[PDB]
Amino acid sequence: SGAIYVGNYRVVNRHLATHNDWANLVWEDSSRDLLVSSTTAQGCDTIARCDCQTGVYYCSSRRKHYPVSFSKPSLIFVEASEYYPARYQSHLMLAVGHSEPGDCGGILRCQHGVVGIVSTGGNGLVGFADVRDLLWLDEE
Ligand SMILES: [Zn+2]
């Protein structure tokens, strides 16, 4: 689990979105595994605006933050998990590292802020859903 709280936005994995999230929907995209809902309270997470390929992510299944190198956001074939079939996922970045389904929502951060959240796992890779292209999270 986990989320990003920026301005009056909550960013979660689409597959973990709650009724309240859908009842306050701003934007969602299945192909990216992202959903954004509106919040009453102001959040303070800063979204990275950059092309960094190094950062640190939180892995709940190890109670650890790991420094990683990661690929640029791309359309990648993802093998079946507990929560999605085998399919193409867009805006996905991969690193060498540990990721189990419960790790989804863990933040990847660089020197500029939040890069994305854990979305995929398996075969010794961890996949992150990028948010750095979502420039509207910073406004309204
Ligand atoms: Zn950065």
Task: Supply the DSSP symbol for 33.
Answer: T
Q: How was this structure determined?
A: X-ray
Residues forming the annotated binding site for Zn(2+)?
50, 52, 110, 112
Q: In terms of domains, do 10 and 64 share one?
A: no
Burial string for 34-57 (b: 16+ CB within 10 Å, else e) reads bbbbebeeebebebbeeebeebeb
Indicate if 17 and 40 belong to the same structural domain. Answer: yes
Is 33 an active-site residue? yes
3 contact partners, CB below 8 Å, separation of at least 6: 10, 11, 12, 105, 117
Q: Looking at the structure, do residues 51 and 107 belong to the same domain, yes or no?
A: yes
| 123 CA distance to ligand 1 middle (Å) | 26
Do 49 and 81 have their domain in common? yes
Instruction: Tally the domains of the chain.
Output: 2
- Expressed as residue numbers, the domain containing 36 is 3-44
What whole-number distance in Å separates Cα of residue 137 and Cα of residue 140? 8
